[PDB]
């Protein structure tokens, strides 16, 4: 239920202590929490603010195809992963523009700086889309989600298709208590742009229904959790479709649950608004595998949220 | 609190749906559960039945030291591996007094925690690294130890039940959350609570911190159908205060702790309740 996500934000505002963080922004933080969404009551795309479903769709199809380079995302006008690739490029020996140290805070404080950032980010997006060599080197985020889900590398010259394996297991061993996918690969963590926020997840079958639990080590509550929720709920529906099952519950478990301190006014404005009905998900019935779905095969119908509430991403 | 454990038992007896399992025994199960233990309130070794802290501590020190050979356990009267290692051989004093040959137990917690193999043939020490990160960078959201390698899982007889755990530091207190994919709620969960609360206290000791909370997250939480009468007996008994953990103050590093260095004071449980392993 949406009220479950809104009660987490209110608990952080009330009693989550201040914790300095890697980004330099500052957060209010709790440790250890659990929410549940019954997917039979509606698709959990939040209605108390507008959440863009097409960016959640394109990000998950990107994961599912095993891709860890942002060119696919830019082709679909999805810029949610741009920051970390831009930071990689401004730190390299090839960047020749104005200094971009600490650009993620500087843009909020200094209009002259903000215009130079906007200029350099444009030139970056154009180069990824138009120069294949530039994209191959500077679009690359390392072995994040797509690579661990489809291509966990072995010590003997091969790779494990972890996500296709677990879908198969659901079909022939549905009571198995080892239906797990992990993106936590210790050997690859240091070279990933960021280590996986949404860390490992497990499926469960009973009485013809599929359920999924996620363990999320680090949750940005205002900007990232509404995307996370909707992404794992879509993944659970696609798998249920291929395996011929009905949908059960998504259980979301958090580690460090944090509100960044420059999202507090946004959270308070969200908390003032009346919840509406969740929308319904519609999937193309003639697609058989999760891997065959494309953008036009997936939609939400009946979505009528309250207005967008903008907030800055912590880099 | 102990009541939060007993509440999980009672919920599965009332609402757990019937669900078949690997062993062919019946179970009543729920998916997704979370319990909190505030370690300032007492050390969570259950009072409503006796739980053997001796086997928990020899097993936990064995893993911490990255040891994987049973000699260590046998010396400390923990037999939870005896038959298997003999069965390996058939294909016990000599282990104590041949041990290097017939006494090794491969791909288990100690090795994944302190010797995770990489593609080039070197090894990551996850637990040493996380201790050093607690000391230098306590606000880190990446304080993670994983036991789950998909390259290894398909060939082992029991893939890890304790798939990964995470630490957290605030106001000078250390907390730990465990993700446990599969929980036998009568027999395994009481042992599991104590193990991971003890690990939270040993790490807080090594890092100069006080204790916060142990948060226990469950995937498939199940009562075996032949443990129902035992759970019902336990639920009829009055809860008592948890005992107090005492660690040896005169030893800096826990990597030099042994059995005599870890004690529980004030433990006053109701009697042992017997049941079968599935
Ligand atoms: N700080 C932070 N970094 C992170 C995450 C996170 O949740 N928080 N992620 C966690 O998985 C990944 C990125 N996910 C993101 C999700 C949403 C938006 C975002 O800015 N949403 C805005 C604007 C959307 C739009 O472009 O229209 C919004 O929802 O209003 C950014 C990154 C990697 N890095
Ligand atoms: O420390 C332990 C070890 C084992 N189990 C139980 C959980 C399951 O009943 C069984 C393992 O069976 P699978 O989940 O792998 O089927 O052992 C625990 O609860 N805790």
Residue numbers in the entry:
A (entry chain B): 1 to 315
B (entry chain A): 1 to 91, 125 to 130, 134 to 314
Original paper wording:
Thymidylate synthase (TS, EC 2.1.1.45) is a ubiquitous enzyme that catalyzes the reductive methylation of 2′-deoxyuridine-5′-monophosphate (dUMP) to 2′-deoxythymidyne-5′-monophosphate (dTMP) using N5,N10-methylenetetrahydrofolate (mTHF) as a cofactor. In cells, TS provides the only synthetic source of dTMP necessary for DNA biosynthesis. TS subunits are characterized by two domains, known as large and small domains (LD and SD, respectively).
The structure of EfTS in complex with the substrate dUMP was determined to be 1.75 Å resolution. The cofactor-analogue (6S)-5-formyl-6-tetrahydrofolate (5-FTHF) is entrapped in the active sites of subunits B and D by the same tight network of interactions already observed in the substrate-free form of the enzyme. In the partner subunits (A and C), the electron density of the catalytic Cys197 suggests that it had been oxidized to sulfenic acid (S-oxycysteine, CSX197 in Figure 3). Despite the oxidation of Cys197, the substrate dUMP populates the active site, showing its uracil moiety positioned just above the cysteine sulphur (C6–Sγ distance of ~3.7 Å). The dUMP phosphate is salt-bridged to Arg22, Arg217, Arg177’, and Arg178’ (the last two from the partner subunit) and it is further H-bonded to the hydroxyl of Ser218. The most evident rearrangement concerns the flexible loop 18–26, which moves towards the catalytic cavity in the dUMP-bound subunits, exposing Arg22 inside the phosphate recognition pocket. The movement of Arg22, whose Cα shifts by ~5.8 Å, is fundamental to create the four-arginine cluster that anchors the dUMP phosphate in the substrate site. This observation strongly suggests that in EfTS, the open/closed transition occurs as a biphasic process in which the dUMP accommodation triggers the closure of the loop 18–26, whereas the binding of the cofactor (or analogue) induces the movement and the organization of the whole SD.
